[PDB]
Design an enzyme around this catalytic site. Structure first.
Site, mmCIF file in Angstrom:
data_model
loop_
_atom_site.group_PDB
_atom_site.id
_atom_site.type_symbol
_atom_site.label_atom_id
_atom_site.label_comp_id
_atom_site.label_asym_id
_atom_site.label_seq_id
_atom_site.Cartn_x
_atom_site.Cartn_y
_atom_site.Cartn_z
ATOM 1 N N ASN A 160 -5.155 6.164 -4.867
ATOM 2 C CA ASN A 160 -4.256 6.863 -4.450
ATOM 3 C C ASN A 160 -3.997 7.870 -5.430
ATOM 4 O O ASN A 160 -3.058 8.539 -4.889
ATOM 5 N N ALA A 203 0.962 -1.197 -0.027
ATOM 6 C CA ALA A 203 0.103 -0.283 -0.026
ATOM 7 C C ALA A 203 0.797 0.957 -0.124
ATOM 8 O O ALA A 203 0.193 2.024 -0.722
ATOM 9 N N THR A 250 4.536 -6.050 6.563
ATOM 10 C CA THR A 250 5.465 -5.855 6.808
ATOM 11 C C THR A 250 5.304 -4.502 6.944
ATOM 12 O O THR A 250 5.534 -3.532 7.175
ATOM 13 N N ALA A 295 6.220 -11.282 3.972
ATOM 14 C CA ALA A 295 6.223 -11.501 5.284
ATOM 15 C C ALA A 295 5.669 -12.383 6.027
ATOM 16 O O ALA A 295 4.882 -12.225 7.005
ATOM 17 N N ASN A 327 -10.659 2.725 2.965
ATOM 18 C CA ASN A 327 -10.979 2.433 1.694
ATOM 19 C C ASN A 327 -12.500 1.824 1.427
ATOM 20 O O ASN A 327 -12.436 2.787 0.410
ATOM 21 N N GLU A 379 4.409 22.852 12.567
ATOM 22 C CA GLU A 379 3.198 22.777 13.493
ATOM 23 C C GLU A 379 2.009 22.675 13.782
ATOM 24 O O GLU A 379 1.119 22.865 14.905
#
Lengths: 82, 386, 427, 49, 428
Positions: free
Chosen positions: B217, B12, B134, B88, B195, B235
């Site tokens: 995206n 992602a 991961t 992973a 999503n 800030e």
């Protein structure tokens, strides 16, 4: 096959021995006869020297230059030595 | 000299990073072989090449290799692109404890070189998600290492938060509770997106059906560029967070409309300020009317119970709007989303579902209970500041 | 770099396996010469997962073919795509097992078990960082299953932190060929409930009813059934080969599926299946594909979902396709139908979307079901094991060379405890 | 327009492969018929014997 | 210009020593008549090493042929040696060897050796930087060992600083085409354990199984059997004839690879060894070449390496390879299966590369390794003696010249003394 190869080697060796025993004259005679590496001329030279012919023709083809079949003329005399 | 360094972790992360660097090289004049035919995020070689300040990291080569072969190959220095050998396996176990130790050293060393070639440090932008292995564990390892290492320079993270109803992985509450447990204190601030809410807003504001990941995206890249469009960041950190646990603002963008309706409807400042507060146009599917707003930041590019124009992407859907506002709000609405996520975790952990993979890789049985109690503590902290 | 090593077992594997390597290879553009002829650049990128490189730019598969009658290797090598292998990897005995557990497990397979692990070793040693293996077989015969349950369990004791995927063509009772198939399937789940990290359960009875109603074929040979099996391994490791908008690895898909360890038997199923006389009329989209992958007749196990309640669901999709239409369409099937799903799993459905479809298709998918009624495939084998073994109908041909009366009933309740482990989670 | 043109080309490709399926089915049916003719022929030969 | 003096022995080593020369001749180009034939000038740079030059374009070898029977050198003359080398040094009689050790050492070994050593001493004294001795023999027969130890024993008595490069096909446990092979070993241990420098220990058995499994050929005769021995003795000397990116002489390979005063019994292997079909189906570059040569499958012995360790392993290489790649990949095999090697040397292996491969091959190597796995061959020949000892089973040719029931068993103790002094350092 390797045995016949060694036989042809010893044959060319005795040919060079006879050449020592003239070289230019032999070369000229061979050129005037059949062919520089002619199998028929090869068998004639055989008879002469005394190397008593399918195997003889095979050895002639081996010496005969690829395609040329004249053993490269100058190199033909060179193999007659060899 | 106001630089920031971007790391994109997980799948992602790299697909939102590709759309991001598309938008930034679009925004400047940088055609994507790096040569102008700006240096807040770019380093300029003497030949005339622009290199980004970006590190990509994933543990399947099939998602970095698309970037390495595709049309952006002449943008990067080709050992910025970290690549594993075995993924992973959607494990906190594998991203944290077992597989991530083959690449965390290279990740830190490229961070070290990219943070020594700079002149004044302001922050990092880590792009990740709360579903995967991961996206949880390697991000937590990177988080703790960089907060221990660099000190007080601000780390901003962008998280695709797991949706109220619909999710791909079965295992997701486990990874999400476990990653927030140790990514509370190290990060400085992180932002939430969902999503399912982006699917509903993509269904009804811009009149498109069947959206996909490039159409999501693009929106996330426009939001990130609108956040960091005041440089061409501390800030926010001293404005939004009351206490050092509540560092999850929500975000939205007000004029997300297609060209066919944008031609008829003008976009006043009043229209975009109220369209930020409309709950139909929120981008995290929570109920804000059950919440009370504790803070708002309104960045204007170009009952409501308090407690440089945008650019155009080629092959895009968002219309060219002269002025826009990005809302970075902080609400008391996430008290229901955390309750439902920790309930989803609790149902599976009543009878020890899926536990023995992570048990045989690294952790004990109480190492999930620690995250459970440290998230119950977070919802007593929202109820406390109620 | 996340590789795999294929293996075979018996005749039933080699017809599937040699059909498998003409499904992967022509999907990678590779001729049976081995010369690459492909349009795209993505194909040569991930050859390293299943293959290996020969001198000259030729590609060799990473597989070993093993069996105990040499007639079944000559059949493979003479085939259209059989030449590609290593002739040193072709390993086979000479004295036939002959549906003998006591041969394939105890005496006859133990003068081939020296030779086969060396071929396992030196081919899985050139790999840089392994992910696991593969074994394709059935659970009816002797050396396709008794050596196949030794080749798993020995390999479990050397590389135990990888993922050893397997297949299993389950003995159908109503579609039967061997008289003594209870005596080989019940002794095979014993050493396979504890030694594979995932194992599928396909069987030949449901592979006929997928082929007599949906496909509506006239004459199904054994080349159109094992074509269905080799096209649902390509689905479950496409993310391991090709990129996508959301990808789930092999080891990701193991963690999310199994609730408790002994429940790793799955139910495969391929989502677009049409007859050749009714293909143009059918529209291809995602709502008109989710109604074929949850069907009770498009499921390659003889079991039924509706006599049980679902545990977990995976669905790898392939193609150019939007992601809202995956995310909420499989909410909806989870949402309307609430009896068939468990209630201590608040979200019962996975997903994964690749970018590259199977060849000659605009859209495809692959279902993986994990039902709870699959105990009805284990109650229907044990009751054919309480009958023959009570009067001892056939035992003296397997116990004449190595086992005992206790070795079966040690491994009968070790297959019968798994029925009750599904029963406690059934409600 | 570009997506529409790609759709038309891909649909024409699939109808070409369906036409291939039709021709091979007709070939298989004629093969079965010639097998039937061969069986009739040598059965008549046996009757002559 | 460095040299090693050859001699040829036995019926066994004569044919392999006849097989010695034809492998060398294609590396450079000496036609059997004598004409040099090879376009690479690096062949022409070191024609001294095994050879002598002749006037008239010819070239000739350096080896003297002895066997106690005529026909073996009449069989070598059927090969190319009489076509190249001088017809003086063929030293053959028609007398009976008898395959007695005591008639290979005492009757025609005694008479016919001084018509050989006068030319063994001649080729040494003609040049200056002589360094070695070669003698291609066997441990097998009586007459291949009775003359074999004779040409070793009395010569270190006057050439005591030399590279003695013997050969010994050992008595196999199973393959036996001679009923007197268990006797001819323990005689050849009285002298050749002290007076050697390197030994190519082969047997007949292990040259079939390489040809059965790996080569997948269905007939090893004695003809092509020798390329598993003849081609791998030519790997060691390509440091001398030919250049490289590193160089290791056979005084250096005496230094690097012999660790002990007496442990110098070797066991070779050639690297692209495969069948006809599998060579397209297996890559053999350096990352796969090292995984082949360290199998239990390219050995010249039948002993079990996992019933032992490895004392000193070397490997000479041949070809254009990256020395990063050889140093890394040797490091992996040294560390992965690290429990094979002994604890004495911290870097238990040895490597040396060159820049000339054999013909027709992109790459090769030639692995020669001094293991300690050969130790349980020694118990066999003590057993194949002890059955033939309480019977005195064949001793009526050996008692004719004379070796008593004590003179065998005080050399039998010597075989155990080749194990006992080896055993004292076998464990702690």
């Amino acid at each position: 096959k390797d045995h016949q190869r060694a036989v042809v080697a010893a044959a060319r060796h005795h040919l060079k021995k006879f050449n020592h025993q003239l070289q230019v004259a032999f070369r000229h005679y061979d050129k005037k006869g059949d062919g520089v590496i002619d199998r028929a001329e090869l068998h004639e030279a055989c008879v002469q020297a005394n190397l008593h012919k399918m195997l003889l023709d095979h050895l002639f083809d081996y010496c005969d230059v690829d395609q040329d079949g004249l053993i490269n003329y100058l190199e033909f005399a060179n193999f007659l030595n060899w | 000299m106001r630089e920031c360094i971007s790391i994109h972790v997980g799948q992602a992360g790299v697909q939102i990073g590709n759309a991001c660097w598309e938008l930034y090289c679009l925004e400047h004049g940088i055609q994507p072989d790096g040569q102008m035919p700006f240096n807040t995020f770019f380093s300029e070689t003497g030949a005339g090449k622009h290199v980004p300040r970006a590190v990509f990291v994933d543990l399947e080569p099939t998602v970095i290799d698309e970037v390495r072969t595709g049309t952006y190959r002449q943008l990067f220095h080709p050992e910025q692109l970290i690549t594993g050998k075995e993924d992973a396996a959607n494990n906190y176990a594998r991203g944290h404890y077992t597989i991530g130790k083959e690449i965390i050293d290279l990740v830190l060393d490229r961070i070290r070189k990219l943070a020594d070639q700079c002149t004044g440090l302001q922050g990092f932008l880590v792009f990740h998600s709360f579903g995967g292995g991961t996206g949880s564990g390697f991000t937590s390892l990177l988080m703790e290492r960089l907060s221990v290492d660099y000190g007080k320079k601000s780390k901003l993270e962008f998280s695709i938060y797991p949706a109220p109803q619909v999710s791909t992985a079965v295992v997701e509450p486990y990874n999400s509770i476990l990653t927030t447990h140790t990514t509370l204190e190290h990060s400085d601030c992180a932002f939430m997106v969902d999503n399912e809410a982006i699917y509903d807003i993509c269904r009804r504001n811009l009149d498109i059906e069947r959206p996909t990941y490039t159409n999501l995206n693009r929106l996330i890249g426009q939001i990130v560029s609108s956040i960091t469009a005041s440089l061409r960041l501390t800030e926010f950190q001293t404005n939004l967070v009351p206490y050092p646990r509540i560092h999850f603002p929500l975000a939205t963008y007000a004029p997300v409309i297609s060209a066919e309706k944008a031609y008829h409807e003008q976009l006043s400042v009043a229209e975009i300020t109220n369209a930020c507060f409309e709950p139909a146009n929120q981008m995290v599917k929570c109920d804000p009317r059950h919440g009370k707003y504790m803070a708002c930041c309104l960045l204007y590019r170009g009952t409501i119970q308090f407690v440089q124009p945008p650019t155009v992407v080629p092959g895009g859907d968002l219309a060219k709007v002269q002025r826009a506002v990005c809302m970075l709000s902080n609400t008391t609405a996430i008290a229901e989303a955390w309750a439902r996520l920790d309930h989803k975790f609790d149902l599976m952990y009543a009878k020890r579902a899926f536990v023995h993979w992570y048990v045989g890789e690294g952790m004990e049985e109480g190492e999930f209970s620690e995250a459970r109690e440290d998230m119950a503590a977070l919802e007593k902290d929202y109820e406390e500041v109620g | 770099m996340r590789e795999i090593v294929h293996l075979q077992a018996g005749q039933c594997g080699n017809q599937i396996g040699a059909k498998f390597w003409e499904v992967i290879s022509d999907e990678h553009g590779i001729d049976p010469t081995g010369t690459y002829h492909g349009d795209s650049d993505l194909q040569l990128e991930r050859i390293n997962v299943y293959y290996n490189e020969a001198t000259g730019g030729k590609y060799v598969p990473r597989a070993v073919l093993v069996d105990l009658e040499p007639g079944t290797m000559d059949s493979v090598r003479s085939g259209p795509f059989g030449q590609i292998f290593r002739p040193d990897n072709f390993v086979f005995g000479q004295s036939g097992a002959g549906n003998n557990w006591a041969k394939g497990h105890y005496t006859e397979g133990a003068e081939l078990v020296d030779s086969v692990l060396d071929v396992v070793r030196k081919e899985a040693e050139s790999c840089d960082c392994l992910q696991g293996f593969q074994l394709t077989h059935s659970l009816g015969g002797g050396t396709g299953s008794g050596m196949g349950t030794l080749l798993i369990s020995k390999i479990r004791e050397e590389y135990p932190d990888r993922i050893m995927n397997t297949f299993s063509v389950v003995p159908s009772p109503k579609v039967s060929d061997t008289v003594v198939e209870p005596y080989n399937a019940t002794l095979s789940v014993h050493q396979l409930v504890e030694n594979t990290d995932e194992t599928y359960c396909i069987d030949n009875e449901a592979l006929y009813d997928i082929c007599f109603r949906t496909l509506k074929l006239t004459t199904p040979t054994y080349g159109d059934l094992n074509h269905l099996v080799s096209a649902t391994m390509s689905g479950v490791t496409t993310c391991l080969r090709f990129p996508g908008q959301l990808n789930a690895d092999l080891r990701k898909l193991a963690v999310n599926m199994v609730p408790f360890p002994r429940l790793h038997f799955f139910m495969p199923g391929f989502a677009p299946l049409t007859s050749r006389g009714s293909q143009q009329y059918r529209a291809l989209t995602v709502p008109e594909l989710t109604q074929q992958m949850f069907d009770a007749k498009n499921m390659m196990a003889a079991c039924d979902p509706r006599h049980g309640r679902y545990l977990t669901v995976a669905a790898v999709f392939r193609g150019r396709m939007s992601m809202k239409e995956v995310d909420e369409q499989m909410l909806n099937v989870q949402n309307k139908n609430s009896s068939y799903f468990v209630e201590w799993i608040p979200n019962n459905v996975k997903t994964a979307v690749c970018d590259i479809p199977p060849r000659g298709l605009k859209m495809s998918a692959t279902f993986i079901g994990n039902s709870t009624a699959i105990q009805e495939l284990f109650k229907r084998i044990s009751e054919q094991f309480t009958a023959m073994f009570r009067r001892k109908a056939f035992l003296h041909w397997y116990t004449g060379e190595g086992m005992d009366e206790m070795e079966f009933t040690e491994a009968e309740s070790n297959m019968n405890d798994l029925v009750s482990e599904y029963q406690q989670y059934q409600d | 327009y570009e997506q529409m043109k790609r759709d038309a080309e891909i649909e024409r490709i699939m109808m070409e492969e369906h036409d291939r399926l039709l021709k091979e089915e007709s070939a298989k049916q004629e093969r079965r018929n010639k097998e039937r003719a061969q069986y009739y022929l040598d059965l008549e030969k046996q009757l002559e014997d």
